[PDB]
Amino acid sequence: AXXPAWX
Amino acid sequence: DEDETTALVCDNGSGLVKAGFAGDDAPRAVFPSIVGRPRHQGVMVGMGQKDSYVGDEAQSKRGILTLKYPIEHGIITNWDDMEKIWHHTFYNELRVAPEEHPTLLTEAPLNPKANREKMTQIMFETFNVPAMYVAIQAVLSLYASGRTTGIVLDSGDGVTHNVPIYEGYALPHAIMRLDLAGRDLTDYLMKILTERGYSFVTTAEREIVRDIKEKLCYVALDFENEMATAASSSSLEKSYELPDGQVITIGNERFRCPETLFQPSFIGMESAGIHETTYNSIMKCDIDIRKDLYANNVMSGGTTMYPGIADRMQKEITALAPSTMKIKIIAPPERKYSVWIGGSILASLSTFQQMWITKQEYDEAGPSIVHRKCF
Amino acid sequence: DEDETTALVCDNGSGLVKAGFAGDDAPRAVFPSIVGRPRHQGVMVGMGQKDSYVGDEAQSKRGILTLKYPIEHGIITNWDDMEKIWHHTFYNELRVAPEEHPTLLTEAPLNPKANREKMTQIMFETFNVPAMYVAIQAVLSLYASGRTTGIVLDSGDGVTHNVPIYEGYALPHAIMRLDLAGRDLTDYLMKILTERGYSFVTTAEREIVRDIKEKLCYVALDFENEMATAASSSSLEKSYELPDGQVITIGNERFRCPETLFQPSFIGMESAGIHETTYNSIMKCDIDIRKDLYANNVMSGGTTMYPGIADRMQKEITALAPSTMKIKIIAPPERKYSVWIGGSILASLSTFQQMWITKQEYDEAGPSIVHRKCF
Amino acid sequence: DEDETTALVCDNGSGLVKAGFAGDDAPRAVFPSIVGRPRHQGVMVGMGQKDSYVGDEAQSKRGILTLKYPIEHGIITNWDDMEKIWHHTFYNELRVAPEEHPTLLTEAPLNPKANREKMTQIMFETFNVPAMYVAIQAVLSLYASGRTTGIVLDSGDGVTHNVPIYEGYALPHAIMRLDLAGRDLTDYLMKILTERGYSFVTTAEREIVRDIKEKLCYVALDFENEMATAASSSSLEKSYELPDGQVITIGNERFRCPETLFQPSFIGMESAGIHETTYNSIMKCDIDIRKDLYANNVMSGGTTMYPGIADRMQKEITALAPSTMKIKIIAPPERKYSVWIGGSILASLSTFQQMWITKQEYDEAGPSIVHRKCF
Ligand SMILES: Nc1ncnc2c1ncn2[C@@H]1O[C@H](COP(=O)(O)OP(=O)(O)O)[C@@H](O)[C@H]1O
Ligand SMILES: Nc1ncnc2c1ncn2[C@@H]1O[C@H](COP(=O)(O)OP(=O)(O)O)[C@@H](O)[C@H]1O
Ligand SMILES: Nc1ncnc2c1ncn2[C@@H]1O[C@H](COP(=O)(O)OP(=O)(O)O)[C@@H](O)[C@H]1O
Ligand SMILES: [Mg+2]
Ligand SMILES: [Mg+2]
Ligand SMILES: [Mg+2]
């Protein structure tokens, strides 16, 4: 979750 | 080849692979961390024309490729493409076998631990390295300074750090991470170039805009008077010849691009800025650390070769820090490479050779060994 | 005439002028944004035969004219021809004096600012409007929805938008712009009609192909099974009588034309598609915005009257968005006009009458006033 | 005969059959793509006098025949007459059996796919070739150059191309097609010869005018000063002895004939010209392709043996392209044959022998196999 890249 | 067991220092931040050997001045291989791939059909029969172009060759052919960065905000997103990047790193550029050399990888703090863990699994399972070690990138950026006390800002292509260290001891509660870095500045510059009249939308045109950002941008010590300075006359305009023809002429975009780094509201990102995350990392440290962080404020990765960012940096941290403090922004012109250079120092230390995560200890403890030996 | 000072709402996207008054249901004047011009000599003496035909008259005479759109991808290229278009707009079609009425122009986000600035200079200097205001076109497309929260796709003749708005606040970092729209679909349809056997190359024949696209195209909810459905039998073939004689019969070209909108590789354009630029505009917004963008996904300009594009749109955004999210594609059948209709709402608001860029403020601050009063 | 299974390279553009074997310098058979037919009655009894004359024999008897080209603008119109042309090609001129040889046909881009499909059906069903392959004609014109990067103009008798290719990859969205070529120039020359005083109206007289165009025409680097040069003195007049007697003397018609190629308004055809369709094909390519298209602008089919058309070509593309670009018009004097020569290269490649559309794959997948194996 988050990001793009993060989950 | 290499007649010894010299350690490899591979440093992919998020946008530029810089790899080489330990005990070495500069990285031997510096190339873009891209993997390109043809987006329309091959017509000349008998050509070669492999269906993957990694590294500098991809920028040689970027007019017919869709360029794709396998590592975004310091997090590896494509794992098979990062294996293309590592395979090209060891076997084509650095031109060596990974089975013979311990390797030193780098990543950022506050990263997903599956990045570090899968990076260890790919180093031992796929490339069969004898030893391996992940390293916090700003820490190594302080190894290149020759200092054991200082707070480190580096700001690579996907992440910026502010790791404070005092007398050899890091302060991991006072650590920082902002996901605003040079690829975000490239995208914002590409947006305001669309504001002036020049439309860049392709990944290859994104690489052109990144080149405009590198050649032709500075940081504007006082942003309001520089802004009105560009609004007054055309003495700040500067032309850039695009590949294959048309020239462009940029004005206030020359310094509005890294002002986003000092003011992240431009890219719509709720943060405090670079200058306030340094000061907040210092204020999270103890009271008896802070003047030794003020006088040792190392500013040493990529996206810091904007002219005047140490002047803006000292000029703004001085406004935050109390008076009668000595604010020294260390900006050593060998940065963009000093994370690698401190990797070369750390891997060439003699105390360090029992800190490698070795195989038969990877095989004993699985891939989670990195969370007891690395940090 | 008009016994009041009602504001003009002129809306030239890139391919169709729709103009009228504020406080009004539909635009009073809808005509093609073309200027035609004779390409061979006049022989009947005593004829009139003016050497410029603007608007609908140009399509009445397009067999002897070279039609030319003065506005391409939302950017005005010919300025004297756009002045022909505006002159015909106010004085012939809408049949009114611009000196008596504030005017509301529209353009796209991420446009060159000399388009907006020269449009303001032409409105005050040439037509002598008392007040003037440029407006972001998808924002107005949300004014017609009666919503203050939603992400707006419109896709006119030269540009598509995806402007996200939450609780009245736009997210200009999460804004989008793709230069794939209906004139590009007209050109691609003209190419694949050349693949079937029908050669259309003239600008008038381009206008015929545009008519074939409007009458006789849908979007194909599942493109592969629709493609094999057309390959199996001739139940998808449909005939179109060309002007002056010969009939044509089109098959898979009926739905390969707007699949380019969902898959821009067909026209050789490196992009993500309409459905992924919506999802990427939503993911660029904050975490607490997204379900209110999922349930309010307004799809409201031209080139969206393809049958089933809301079904393809929901069917593909649902595949991108997480489950337990409510994807509502708002496709209000009054679109192709809702940018004008929301222009009529905004210009008829009472809070808005101090947001007009007025003359004596244009004369005070030059033509750059648009970058402090408009947005 | 032929003791091997050498591939046939048959190349009918629209007006001249040039056929031969693969792995060969020049085409073995070059003859006009006409089929003649007697238009009045046979009176000498015991004569032979077959009621169809194909190829060069038709120009030997064109005074008593109505000559008819079975292929118009690169599209085969008469199929039985094209079967006469192919039958004469294999069995009379090239004097070989098609059952023993794979054949390489050529056509233009953006053609009706029933041309390609029916050409495959006639090659397998009628002539029983073992393998067959249609090929894009300008692509093969780049195979003869020894280049894998360049934009190709060829301009045969019925069609002109501009296919751009970069590093072996064609850019099919940037492809072009104009239906202005040498038969149209022959008709326009025949019209302006009627303007001077010489009436040519028969198909045989059309063949005489085509001969006048080949012998006695150049392209006029600067058309206005060449036009006034012919208007000043008679130093540009040149005489041509017609068959059987009367001599003619042509002036400005010597260079007004291929100026139609650079300026299609003369034949009443709404287009941009040859020099602007090249530049528009280059500008449709990506930014990082264009200087490698500027320096590799191959100009290699028929109707390019006008003297000075490379000088006019470079002189006009330089005026369109930006400065500090290197415009190299490649005009290799073996053109008019280089589509065949590149056909000979491609059919003699060893990588290519699994790209033939073979029989038992034609029989398996019908005649639509050409749209998955050819391009
Ligand atoms: N001279 C320069 N001026 C401004 N920015 C630069 C310069 N050189 C590199 N950059 C930017 O720095 C980033 C790369 O920094 P670096 O730390 O080497 O990246 P990585 O994170 O891959 O190690 C790129 O985004 C590049 O655009
Ligand atoms: N019923 C329809 N189906 C498909 N496309 C349409 C239809 N009506 C209009 N279009 C296309 O929409 C475009 C015009 O939409 P509009 O939003 O009015 O354009 P503008 O950008 O000029 O406002 C034209 O390209 C036209 O071909
Ligand atoms: N020396 C020449 N100068 C000018 N035009 C020529 C010359 N030779 C041939 N042509 C023209 O070129 C055309 C044939 O070109 P080519 O490409 O060989 O035809 P095809 O398209 O049938 O292959 C004919 O129209 C002929 O008039
Ligand atoms: Mg780095
Ligand atoms: Mg619109
Ligand atoms: Mg030819």
Side-chain angles (χ1 to χ4, degrees), chain C residues 11 13-14 18 137 154-157 301-302 336 339:
Chain C
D11 192 0
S14 72
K18 49 191 71 64
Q137 201 163 358
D154 54 356
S155 308
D157 201 7
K336 189 170 70 177
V339 283

PDB file of all heavy atoms in Angstrom, chain C residues 11 13-14 18 137 154-157 301-302 336 339, ligand 5:
ATOM      1  N   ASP C  11     -17.152  27.469 -26.758  1.00  0.00           N
ATOM      2  CA  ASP C  11     -16.423  26.247 -26.439  1.00  0.00           C
ATOM      3  C   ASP C  11     -15.962  25.626 -27.751  1.00  0.00           C
ATOM      4  O   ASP C  11     -16.716  24.907 -28.409  1.00  0.00           O
ATOM      5  CB  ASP C  11     -17.297  25.301 -25.645  1.00  0.00           C
ATOM      6  CG  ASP C  11     -16.529  24.161 -25.044  1.00  0.00           C
ATOM      7  OD1 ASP C  11     -15.303  24.060 -25.228  1.00  0.00           O
ATOM      8  OD2 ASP C  11     -17.169  23.357 -24.362  1.00  0.00           O
ATOM      9  N   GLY C  13     -13.384  22.962 -28.592  1.00  0.00           N
ATOM     10  CA  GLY C  13     -12.443  22.014 -28.055  1.00  0.00           C
ATOM     11  C   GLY C  13     -11.241  21.863 -28.954  1.00  0.00           C
ATOM     12  O   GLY C  13     -10.173  22.379 -28.623  1.00  0.00           O
ATOM     13  N   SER C  14     -11.376  21.137 -30.064  1.00  0.00           N
ATOM     14  CA  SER C  14     -10.436  21.271 -31.168  1.00  0.00           C
ATOM     15  C   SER C  14     -11.111  21.041 -32.509  1.00  0.00           C
ATOM     16  O   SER C  14     -10.475  21.200 -33.550  1.00  0.00           O
ATOM     17  CB  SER C  14      -9.256  20.319 -31.014  1.00  0.00           C
ATOM     18  OG  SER C  14      -9.653  19.000 -31.264  1.00  0.00           O
ATOM     19  N   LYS C  18     -19.010  25.019 -30.245  1.00  0.00           N
ATOM     20  CA  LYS C  18     -20.325  25.054 -29.630  1.00  0.00           C
ATOM     21  C   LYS C  18     -20.364  26.264 -28.709  1.00  0.00           C
ATOM     22  O   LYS C  18     -19.643  26.331 -27.712  1.00  0.00           O
ATOM     23  CB  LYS C  18     -20.634  23.724 -28.945  1.00  0.00           C
ATOM     24  CG  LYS C  18     -19.578  23.175 -28.036  1.00  0.00           C
ATOM     25  CD  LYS C  18     -19.914  21.766 -27.664  1.00  0.00           C
ATOM     26  CE  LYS C  18     -19.711  20.878 -28.864  1.00  0.00           C
ATOM     27  NZ  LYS C  18     -18.286  20.845 -29.265  1.00  0.00           N
ATOM     28  N   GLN C 137     -11.578  22.417 -19.108  1.00  0.00           N
ATOM     29  CA  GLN C 137     -12.744  21.928 -19.817  1.00  0.00           C
ATOM     30  C   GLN C 137     -13.408  20.776 -19.072  1.00  0.00           C
ATOM     31  O   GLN C 137     -14.638  20.718 -18.987  1.00  0.00           O
ATOM     32  CB  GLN C 137     -12.267  21.563 -21.222  1.00  0.00           C
ATOM     33  CG  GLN C 137     -13.264  21.486 -22.319  1.00  0.00           C
ATOM     34  CD  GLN C 137     -12.566  21.537 -23.663  1.00  0.00           C
ATOM     35  OE1 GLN C 137     -11.347  21.661 -23.729  1.00  0.00           O
ATOM     36  NE2 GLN C 137     -13.333  21.440 -24.743  1.00  0.00           N
ATOM     37  N   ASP C 154     -13.136  13.283 -20.598  1.00  0.00           N
ATOM     38  CA  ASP C 154     -14.058  13.810 -21.600  1.00  0.00           C
ATOM     39  C   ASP C 154     -13.734  13.406 -23.033  1.00  0.00           C
ATOM     40  O   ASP C 154     -14.640  12.989 -23.758  1.00  0.00           O
ATOM     41  CB  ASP C 154     -14.161  15.331 -21.464  1.00  0.00           C
ATOM     42  CG  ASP C 154     -12.857  15.976 -21.506  1.00  0.00           C
ATOM     43  OD1 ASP C 154     -11.885  15.209 -21.555  1.00  0.00           O
ATOM     44  OD2 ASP C 154     -12.806  17.220 -21.494  1.00  0.00           O
ATOM     45  N   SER C 155     -12.475  13.543 -23.459  1.00  0.00           N
ATOM     46  CA  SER C 155     -11.966  13.092 -24.759  1.00  0.00           C
ATOM     47  C   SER C 155     -12.655  13.793 -25.935  1.00  0.00           C
ATOM     48  O   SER C 155     -13.401  13.190 -26.679  1.00  0.00           O
ATOM     49  CB  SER C 155     -12.083  11.568 -24.907  1.00  0.00           C
ATOM     50  OG  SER C 155     -11.516  10.854 -23.830  1.00  0.00           O
ATOM     51  N   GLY C 156     -12.354  15.073 -26.120  1.00  0.00           N
ATOM     52  CA  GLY C 156     -12.887  15.785 -27.276  1.00  0.00           C
ATOM     53  C   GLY C 156     -12.285  15.409 -28.624  1.00  0.00           C
ATOM     54  O   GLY C 156     -11.989  14.244 -28.864  1.00  0.00           O
ATOM     55  N   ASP C 157     -12.109  16.355 -29.542  1.00  0.00           N
ATOM     56  CA  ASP C 157     -11.579  15.964 -30.844  1.00  0.00           C
ATOM     57  C   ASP C 157     -10.056  15.911 -30.868  1.00  0.00           C
ATOM     58  O   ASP C 157      -9.486  15.257 -31.743  1.00  0.00           O
ATOM     59  CB  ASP C 157     -12.069  16.917 -31.937  1.00  0.00           C
ATOM     60  CG  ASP C 157     -11.991  16.311 -33.330  1.00  0.00           C
ATOM     61  OD1 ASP C 157     -11.695  15.112 -33.458  1.00  0.00           O
ATOM     62  OD2 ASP C 157     -12.229  17.030 -34.317  1.00  0.00           O
ATOM     63  N   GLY C 301     -17.333  13.995 -22.360  1.00  0.00           N
ATOM     64  CA  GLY C 301     -17.194  14.896 -23.494  1.00  0.00           C
ATOM     65  C   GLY C 301     -17.643  14.264 -24.796  1.00  0.00           C
ATOM     66  O   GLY C 301     -18.472  13.356 -24.783  1.00  0.00           O
ATOM     67  N   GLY C 302     -17.091  14.703 -25.926  1.00  0.00           N
ATOM     68  CA  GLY C 302     -17.275  14.016 -27.191  1.00  0.00           C
ATOM     69  C   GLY C 302     -16.496  12.714 -27.220  1.00  0.00           C
ATOM     70  O   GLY C 302     -15.918  12.294 -26.223  1.00  0.00           O
ATOM     71  N   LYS C 336     -21.110  15.391 -25.004  1.00  0.00           N
ATOM     72  CA  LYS C 336     -20.696  16.115 -26.208  1.00  0.00           C
ATOM     73  C   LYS C 336     -21.094  17.579 -26.068  1.00  0.00           C
ATOM     74  O   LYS C 336     -20.586  18.419 -26.804  1.00  0.00           O
ATOM     75  CB  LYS C 336     -21.250  15.517 -27.525  1.00  0.00           C
ATOM     76  CG  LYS C 336     -20.752  16.032 -28.856  1.00  0.00           C
ATOM     77  CD  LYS C 336     -21.253  15.121 -29.953  1.00  0.00           C
ATOM     78  CE  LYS C 336     -22.742  15.243 -30.145  1.00  0.00           C
ATOM     79  NZ  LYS C 336     -23.192  14.396 -31.276  1.00  0.00           N
ATOM     80  N   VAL C 339     -19.455  20.031 -21.498  1.00  0.00           N
ATOM     81  CA  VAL C 339     -18.450  21.058 -21.271  1.00  0.00           C
ATOM     82  C   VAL C 339     -19.047  22.436 -21.502  1.00  0.00           C
ATOM     83  O   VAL C 339     -18.782  23.376 -20.738  1.00  0.00           O
ATOM     84  CB  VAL C 339     -17.220  20.788 -22.150  1.00  0.00           C
ATOM     85  CG1 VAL C 339     -16.419  19.691 -21.551  1.00  0.00           C
ATOM     86  CG2 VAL C 339     -17.666  20.299 -23.515  1.00  0.00           C
TER      87      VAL C 339
HETATM   88 MG    MG E   5     -14.716  18.776 -25.677  1.00  0.00          MG
END
